[PDB]
Amino acid sequence: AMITEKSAALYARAVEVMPGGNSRTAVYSSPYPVYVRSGSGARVTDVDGVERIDFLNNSTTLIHGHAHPEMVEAIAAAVGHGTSFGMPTPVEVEYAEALSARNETFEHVRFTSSGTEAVMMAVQAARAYTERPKIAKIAGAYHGAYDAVAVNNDGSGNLISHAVTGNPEGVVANTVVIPFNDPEGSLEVLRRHADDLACVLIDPVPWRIGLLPASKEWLDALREFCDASGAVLISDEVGSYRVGYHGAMQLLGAEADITVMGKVIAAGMPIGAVAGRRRFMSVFDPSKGKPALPHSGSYNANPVSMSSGIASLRLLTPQAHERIGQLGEQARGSMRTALGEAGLDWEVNGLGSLFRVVANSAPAGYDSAAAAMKALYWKLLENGIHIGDSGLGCISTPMGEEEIAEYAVAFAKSLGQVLAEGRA
Amino acid sequence: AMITEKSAALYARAVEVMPGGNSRTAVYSSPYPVYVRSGSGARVTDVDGVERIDFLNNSTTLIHGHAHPEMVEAIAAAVGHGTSFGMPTPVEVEYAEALSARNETFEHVRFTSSGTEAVMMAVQAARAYTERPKIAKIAGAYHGAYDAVAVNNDGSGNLISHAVTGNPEGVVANTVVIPFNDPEGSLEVLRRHADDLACVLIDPVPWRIGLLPASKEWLDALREFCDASGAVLISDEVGSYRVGYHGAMQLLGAEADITVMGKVIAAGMPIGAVAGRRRFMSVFDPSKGKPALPHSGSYNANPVSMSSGIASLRLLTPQAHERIGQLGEQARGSMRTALGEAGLDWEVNGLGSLFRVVANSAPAGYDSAAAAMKALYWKLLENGIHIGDSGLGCISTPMGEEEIAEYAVAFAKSLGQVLAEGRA
Ligand SMILES: Cc1ncc(COP(=O)(O)O)c(/C=N\OC[C@@H]2NC(=O)[C@H](CON)NC2=O)c1O
Ligand SMILES: Cc1ncc(COP(=O)(O)O)c(/C=N\OC[C@@H]2NC(=O)[C@H](CON)NC2=O)c1O
C-alpha cells in the first residue's frame, strides 16, 4: 500500500551530493529512508503526503511535538530580532536562570550548539579541573561522535576497547569501560585507574543497552568512588533528562557533579548544556584572568535556541510531565500485552514518557532480533506510526489517550504482519 | 558618555547562573561585556537602547547582517513546518545541491551543528580514510575546542606543543605543528611524520596569526606533500570561506581534499559542513553496509539551518561578493590612513570583506599592543561601532559606503581618545 516515490526521487538527488545520500547516520534506512516535509502537533507528513503519528520525535528531542504554537511564536519572534550576535543577550541569562532552577546541582551552566559539544566540554572540564587524563564510561553507552566517548558506544556489554576506525591509541587508551549496574565489576576498573581518572561519565538510563535505569546501589558506588578519588561524576542526560522533573540522577536518588543536557531542554532547536557545581564549572570562568578552559562557539547561547529553551521549560510543567508519564506507562502496558498475545519473549523497558521494545528471540523468517525489529519499524510506518528502527519511542505533550489507543491498534496489527511475512 | 547600567544588571544576574557570568569565552570583556537585545541590517541595539554599526557580525557569521528580511522569511517559514525531525527533508537535499555547486571539490557534503563539530568530523574522516594517527596544523591557528585541534591555537608562532590544561599527552602527541607560509620549515616537520600523518589541517587566511593569506609557494608545498604522502589536505574555511566566491583555497589558486565550512554558509543559524571529493567523504557512506565513520547529531541538516543556508547562498550573489569586497578595501584603506595620521605603526590585514587591525608598538600608557587594541575596542563602542577586541572586523551586505565613512570618522576619533588617555 505504502507509496515512497517522492522519497526515492529525493534519495536519487541526495546520493549525488552527500555520502550515500546521508548527513546523519541514525536517520538512514536501506534502501532509502522516508523523507518528511512538515509536522503539526503529534503528527508528521512525509513527502508523499502521508500523515503519521510520531512516537520518536527526532530521537526524543521534541518533548512538545512538532511546531508547538508557543514554541513557533518564541522562535520566529527571536529570529526577527537577530539569529546570533557576537555579544551576550538577555535571553541567555533568563534561560540559564530557568535551567539552573530545575536541579540543585545545576548551579552554573554553559550552552553549546549540541549534546555532542556539551559532552566534549564536560569531559574537557573534568580533565582541566583534575589535571588527570583518563575517563571511565559505560560499556555500550552512546555519548555522540567526540572521539574520547566514541569508544564501546555500540550497545555491546564487552569491556574490550572497541573504537571507530582511525581513532588513535592516544585517545582510546585514556577511555576505560565499566559494566552498567555491576557495582563490584565497576569498582574493580575504577580502583585500578583511580590516580589517573578525571571523571566517571554515565548515562543514568542509557538507550543503546536497553533503556534500563541505573540502580541505587550502582549510583551509590560511583558517587562514593568519585568522592574518595576526586574523579568528577558526570551524568550525560542529553537523552535521559526527561525521565524526571529534576532530571534522571534526581529521580533515581543521586547527585551529579556535572550534568550534560540537550534535546528536550530546547525541544527542537540546536542546544546542549553543561550544568554543575560552581567549583567544577570554575575552569570556564574568564572573569579572574585567562580561564583554565577556553570555551567559545559561534552559536553558544544564541537567542533563537535560548528562546526555544525558555518556551520548552515553561511548557514542561509538573502536570505536563505527569501526563506524558501516565501515557508512557499506558503505551508500555499495551505493547507488553500485544507482544504476549503474539507469543514473543520481547521486553518493553522505559521510565516516564520513554519506551524501548527490546527484541529477544528472532521469530521464524528473520536472521536476527534486530532484523525482526527493523521489519516491525517498517510495518508500523505502513500502519501510520513512526518509532525507532531498534524499538525506541516516546510520548509528546500534544498526545492524548486517542494517539496511545491508535498506537496500540497499529502495534498489534504490525506485529501480526511481521510474523505472517516471516512464515510466508 | 556611555551608559551600560542594564548590561551591568544582566551581568550581576549572569554571574549567579554561569561561570563568571559567561557561556562563550570570545564574547567576554572585563568587567562585563555589553549585552544586546536586537539587530536590524548593519546595526545592533544594546540593552541600554544604544544603536551601533556592527563591524564584526557575530565573528564574521552575519554576511547578510542582522534579521535580513529574506533570511527571516525563509527561517520563520521552516520553523512553522517543524524545527527538526528524525527523518531527512527536501531542504537538506536542496541545500547540499546549492553548497556543492560553490566549488569543484565539494563533490559530497555532510552537515553538522557547528564549525567545531565539522572540524572534528573532517579530522575523524581523514583518520578513518588513512588509518593513520597524526594531524599537522598551523602554529597559532584556531579551529575550535575539539581537543586534537585545541593545540598551539593561541596566535603563537612557536612549534613547541602547547595545549589547554587537562588535554592529555595521548591527544597532544598526535598533533604536530608547522610554521605558516614557511614551505621548507613546514616540509621538515611533515616529512618527519609522513608515514603517520592522516591529514594536514590548514586555514588559508588564519585570523589569530594576523589574517594574512597562505602563499602560493606554501600551498603548492603542502599540496605536493599530501599527494606524495597520502595525507588528506583539509582546508578549514569556517571563517575564511567568505574571502572568495568559491572559497579561500580557490581564490588562492589551490584545491583541498576536504573543506570545512560554517558561519556565512547559513549566515546566522547553527551550521557546519564537511565538503570534499567522494573518496574522502566515502568513510561516512552508510548505504553499502556499516559506515567506516558513523556521524549522527540531533540537529544535523535540520530544516531551519538548511533554510537559513539556502537563503544565505541565494543572497550571496557574485554582485554582493564584489560590492562587500569594495567596502572591505575602502575600510582597510581608511584605517591605514587613520593609523598613519595618528602616528601608530599598526598594520591592517585582510582580503575581500574581512579586515584585522594588528596592533604592533604599544603607545604611551599601555603595557602591551593587546591592551592598546582592547582600549580601541572600548572607544569604538563609545563612538557607535562594534569591532573585535583584537581588531577583527568585516563588511555585511546591508552596509554601503556611508557606513564605512562613518566607521572611518569613529576610528580616527577613537585612536585620538586611546592615545590621550594613555598620556593622562
Ligand atoms: C547520551 C547522549 N549524549 C550525547 C548525545 C549527542 O547529542 P546531540 O549532538 O545533541 O545529538 C546524545 C544524542 N543522541 O544519541 C543518539 C541516540 N542515542 C542512542 O543511544 C541510540 C544509538 O545511537 N547511535 N540512538 C539515538 O538516536 C545522547 O543520547
Ligand atoms: C577556523 C575556524 N574553525 C572552526 C571554528 C569553530 O566554528 P563554530 O563552532 O561554528 O564557532 C571557527 C570559529 N571561531 O573561531 C573563533 C574566531 N577565530 C579566531 O581565530 C579568533 C581567535 O579565537 N578566539 N577569534 C574568533 O572569534 C574557526 O574560525
Author numbering:
A (entry chain B), B (entry chain A): 0 to 423
Can you list sentences taken from the study reporting this PDB entry?
ForI is a PLP-dependent enzyme from the biosynthetic pathway of the C-nucleoside antibiotic formycin. ForI possesses the mixed β-sheet and three-stranded antiparallel β-sheet insertion characteristic of the PLP dependent aspartic aminotransferase family.
After incubating the protein at 4 °C with either 10 mM d or l cycloserine overnight, the protein was crystallised at pH 8 with 10 mM cycloserine, crystals were harvested on day 3 and 1.5 Å diffraction data collected (ESI†). Mass spectrometry (ESI†) and unbiased electron density identified the formation of external aldimine PLP–diketopiperazine adducts, that have retained the stereochemistry of the cycloserine enantiomer used in soaking. In each external aldimine complex, the atoms of the diketopiperazine adduct originating from PLP adopt the same positions as observed for the PMP structure. In both structures the diketopiperazine ring occupies the pocket adjacent to the cofactor. Arg 207 adopts a different conformation than seen in either PLP or PMP structures, in this conformation it makes only a few van der Waals contacts with the adduct. The difference in the rates of formation of the adducts, we suggest would arise from the favourable π-stacking interaction with Trp 206 seen only for l-configured diketopiperazine.
